């Protein structure tokens, strides 16, 4: 039996206020994949890889157990490749593309929002293991 699981994915980010002197980093950020509902996806997810930019140490980051999140600091925006592997090697990995957002849009800045959130939706489809 093939099943559908809605997921959300993307990132949050917070401005430090002032650039850290040592590395010029201006933000803390967390990239993630979550189920939409409050459930445990490690029943069907073996692992989730977050390919960070090459300026990061060991840029291929792997999370084997929830929560599926990576938290870092940074100063610039870049594309992250997210790859979800299923428990079964039958099932094709889901590949997702996400631009890491640091800088608040001017609209959300003017509405008073403290933290940036760039979140997208998807539906994972797979056979029950």
What determination technique applies here?
A: X-ray
| Cβ-contact 52, 70 below 8 angstroms | yes
- Annotated resolution, angstroms: 2.4
Longest Cα separation, the chain: 55
In the numeric block, which tokens belong to residue 22? Answer: 């040592």
CA separation for the pair 79, 71 (Å, rounded):
15
Q: What count of other Cβ atoms lies within 10 Å of the Cβ of residue 100?
A: 22
The one-character DSSP state at 9 is E
Classify strands 69-74 and 94-99 as parallel, antiparallel or unpaired: unpaired
CA separation for the pair 126, 57 (Å, rounded):
33
CA separation for the pair 5, 37 (Å, rounded):
9
Domains and CATH numbers, the chain: 1-129 (2.60.40.1970)
For residue 51, the surrounding DSSP H or E stretch is strand 45-51
| Cβ-contact 129, 115 below 8 angstroms | no
**What does each C-alpha distance from 116 to 14, 25, 43, 62 come to in angstroms?**
7, 16, 31, 24
């Amino acid at each position: 039996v093939t099943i559908v699981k809605p997921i959300v994915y993307g990132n949050v980010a917070r401005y430090f206020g002032k650039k850290r002197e040592e590395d010029g980093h201006t933000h803390q950020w967390t990239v993630y994949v979550k189920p939409y509902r409050n459930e445990d996806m490690s029943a069907y997810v073996k692992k989730i890889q977050f390919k960070l930019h090459e300026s990061y140490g060991n840029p291929l980051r792997v999370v084997t157990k929830p929560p599926y999140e990576i938290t870092e600091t940074g100063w610039g925006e870049f594309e992250i490749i997210i790859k979800i592997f299923f428990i079964d090697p039958n099932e094709r990995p889901v590949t997702l593309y996400h631009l890491l957002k640091l800088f608040q849009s001017d609209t959300n800045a003017m509405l008073g929002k403290k933290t940036v959130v760039s979140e997208f939706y998807d539906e994972m489809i797979f056979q029950d293991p």
